[PDB]
Design a protein around this ligand. Structure first.
Ligand SMILES: O=C1Cc2cc(Nc3nc(Cl)ncc3Br)ccc2N1
Ligand SMILES: O=C1Cc2cc(Nc3nc(Cl)ncc3Br)ccc2N1
Ligand SMILES: [Cl-]
Ligand SMILES: [Cl-]
Lengths: 124, 4, 124, 4
């Protein structure tokens, strides 16, 4: 086509989606990770995770307001990944890399799994 | 704005 | 912080949100523009438009499944802007620039209004 | 991935 493109549009959209998350506006699901609860937008979760994409395209699960994750999932790893989904920034540290990679594999977040594997290979 |  | 960032994350999220729109997945509102209907995600509309942000943060309007736009709004101008919201690409042409600018002013999409004003100033 |  003969379209023009606004370079910062996608980044500005995600920034606004994160502002809605911070003010708890139009969040439509709670993700339960052991004793912790995380409110989010189903669409953003689906856009970032192969697992949430499969869950919310299921004719029964699409209507659930609460999703319980596997008990092996670490709440801090999930929190770090939820922040990444809404900001593109990953808080990857020596102390959390194993939990983050395990959570990203479960959530099916291929690019996160890739950088975790590379950061681990560098430290061996 | 750019030509994509 | 000491975060790393995935450059393409925001673009990939928006691409996935557009795929959900194309398959009509988790769309939660219909925007009526005269005889035409456009299905969309309230969160994406709010993230792109000052008008939709104000509408869906209203305690009564946040719960509406149908929003009727002013009858002066052109359905083609709206369609072009809805595509822009979900893709960052604006199909701006000599034949549609006036309708697109009028619609962007109504929707409160400042960057679109700015490029329309510049393209119009160049042709005078 | 980059250093932002
Ligand atoms: O690593 C990742 C990230 C991700 C996101 C989605 N999300 C969607 N995929 C498609 Cl094709 N359409 C709409 C949506 Br929402 C699917 C798989 C994966 N795997
Ligand atoms: O030209 C534009 C585009 C736009 C988008 C929003 N959306 C939001 N703004 C804020 Cl501050 N927080 C959350 C959201 Br969603 C507000 C105003 C405007 N004006
Ligand atoms: Cl990823
Ligand atoms: Cl804009």
């Amino acid at each position: 086509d003969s379209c023009i493109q606004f370079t910062r549009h996608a980044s500005d959209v995600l920034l606004n989606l994160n502002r809605l998350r911070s003010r708890d506006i139009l969040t439509d699901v709670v993700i339960v990770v052991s004793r912790e609860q995380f409110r989010a937008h189903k669409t953003v979760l689906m856009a970032c995770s192969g697992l949430f994409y499969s869950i919310f395209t299921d004719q029964l699960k699409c209507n659930l307001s609460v999703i319980n994750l596997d008990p092996e999932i670490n709440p801090e790893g999930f929190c770090i990944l939820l922040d990444f989904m809404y900001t593109s920034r990953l808080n990857l540290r020596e102390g959390n890399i194993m939990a983050v990679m395990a959570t990203a594999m479960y959530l099916q977040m291929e690019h996160v799994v890739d950088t975790c594997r590379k950061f681990i290979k560098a430290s061996e | 704005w750019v030509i994509p």
